[PDB]
Symmetry: C3
Amino acid sequence: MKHLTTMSELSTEEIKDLLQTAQELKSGKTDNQLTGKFAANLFFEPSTRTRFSFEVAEKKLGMNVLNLDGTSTSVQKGETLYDTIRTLESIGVDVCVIRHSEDEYYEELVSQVNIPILNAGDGCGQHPTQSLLDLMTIYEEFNTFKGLTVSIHGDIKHSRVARSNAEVLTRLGARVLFSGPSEWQDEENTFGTYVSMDEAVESSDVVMLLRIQNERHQSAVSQEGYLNKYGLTVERAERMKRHAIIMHPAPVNRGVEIDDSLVESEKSRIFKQMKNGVFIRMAVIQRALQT
Amino acid sequence: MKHLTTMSELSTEEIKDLLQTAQELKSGKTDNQLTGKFAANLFFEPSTRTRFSFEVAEKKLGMNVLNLDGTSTSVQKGETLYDTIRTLESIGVDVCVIRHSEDEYYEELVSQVNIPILNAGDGCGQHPTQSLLDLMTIYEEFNTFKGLTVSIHGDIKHSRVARSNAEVLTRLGARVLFSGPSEWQDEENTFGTYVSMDEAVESSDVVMLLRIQNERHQSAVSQEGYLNKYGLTVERAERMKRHAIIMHPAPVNRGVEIDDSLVESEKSRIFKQMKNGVFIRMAVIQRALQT
Amino acid sequence: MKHLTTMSELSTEEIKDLLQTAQELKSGKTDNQLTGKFAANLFFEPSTRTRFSFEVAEKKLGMNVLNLDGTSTSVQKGETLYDTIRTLESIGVDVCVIRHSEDEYYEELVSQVNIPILNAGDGCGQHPTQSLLDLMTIYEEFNTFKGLTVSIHGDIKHSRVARSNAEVLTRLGARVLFSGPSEWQDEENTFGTYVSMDEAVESSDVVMLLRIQNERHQSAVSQEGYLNKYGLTVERAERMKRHAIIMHPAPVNRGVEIDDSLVESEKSRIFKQMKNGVFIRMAVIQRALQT
């Protein structure tokens, strides 16, 4: 049994094995080892795109799926997450996928339960299958991480995914850049150099955009002028390297972080990421249940 | 890949093949051509009975099913319907069933996307599989549409299904009558002849009732006198033709559009329509995915 | 066709056959008799834990599953429960599991409908598959109910399951005791003898704990202090007989009705109950659909 909680808990070699298994699955490799086993999708915090992706993966592996969207009647009655998982084991669930509000909910969980937990997103915001599918997409494009320049743009401060991506990309030998409103930057980041979008589009092999939500303090950082000020405009995209790619974890705010016309332009790998997500999640599930 | 958006977009020949395929599936005919394929039921606007019927159809075809009930998190984050569908294609969904609040949401989509869209209901109220199962039920009863008299009753001008039925039944060789409050009539053609319920019950081979929504009711008195004034009372049903049938799309507002005692009477085919809905939806999915 | 409504409607022989069937299923007996058939889970009032258990049961029997969570669109459009079930029959559902807010909703339905209804909870609180899994767990431990002393603890007056359990245990030849705040006692109970927890722990073969909910309406009984004053403390548990067992339907309010350390202690069968729930539910489904 092998949980998946964070990228930092995986070895460079584990990452590469997962990417390789996903590529093989993407190529059509299939078996019946997991047919009839049970996966529970516990999306305490809803995320339809992520749940759908895991669900296709589970069903492509021949698994039965139990879905929970939003609050559980049990946790409403104060049930511990540990008891929830132990309940699932008792009824015959073999693997749990979890998206949950509590900060690092898994840390205590992982040593105490008897079935693998796959983190689909936590309170701190780690999202390891997103990182993995991102890595897979980059690797398919260039066949290496060494010496790549990867820029990541937007609310870096409040995207643990951005920061966990920067960290793992660094471990893999890539250089990382950040752009966005200065007030959304982590002032003390070991991984990545803060620069302007206008600089990054020219020096990058990979341009990774984040969704610009709407929340936090009074600073709404006008979504209206964001694209021009900070985002990937047509003019900025035109100055990208010939071989460079555009990535975005979705959903995309067209006209905000990116120009509506670029979402499906030739350098965009945005929908390819989504293709890859399923096979990554298949590989993560096989890893979870391998004996 | 064949979408299903509206009845008017189908030829009488296509309509007739769908009915025949449905009757064959209803007779027990099954195959494994769609086994393992994926359908997504995107019921942005909720309709439990319609979703259940499509879901039964998909599963009888051996398909994996992804369900979305109501609000999608992606959409809330501002995802376009086009992006939603493209996402579904990327994760490997083969056909999408959509019920959505936007008027003719499908019109733009069908030229843009690369998998079949099955319209389960749009903003304008087009509901083609409901029309097809109505047609199937009539066809099973009489074995032709040519020379039938079919009357449709209630809020005609605010029922896209009723007006689509009138038009398609006319194309098929039937004579259409309407009845209901004159203020709920849109007699700019609308393909049939406006009459009284009392007249139509005696001349009709088919009496099709519409749900009288509580919203189109002006008062609690308007609804309370409706049955006697406009609806299918016992006395009116007793004047029906020997071989005539009563139809209603459900759910039934008992005691309003029809007397409570008639819903499961000898001439009612209300529940048989629901049986037919599944086989119609199977035929429509097979049509969508035939190569 | 055999409905499951309440324990009082089963004979003691039917109860024993179900337990036997469940035990055989738990041992791995299986067949394809229900493969492809359709179960509808109509959880009008949510209970995630109960739905999950039924769903695993249904899926281990090879059945297709339709899930309804919370409000039904047609129900809110005023559809009677009878019409809903008749609708399900028409679309090809073979069995309905229902959890509904109305007192004895089943009583009218069962004389009217043509497919089996399995009550997963009504307005009164009758929950027969919970009683059955409790009985199974007890029977597995002692191979009999005759002469057993079973004690049940907490808010007896407001727990229909406790009272249903008391009555059926008595029918099966067992001796029932109650403990808890005297104000929560059903003084008019014919089936149980009221005693102190401190007495009950030493005389019981089975200690059944109830969840102590936060009521605060003449049930304001302080939750703090409850464990020491009324609950299963470590000290009380250590005075239980060597063969005796602890049971609880969950979710557990750790530190209230029971000490946190006792939930997974040697005498606890709390999680074993949850294992048994699936097989009991499989048994009840096979009974509904047999011959």
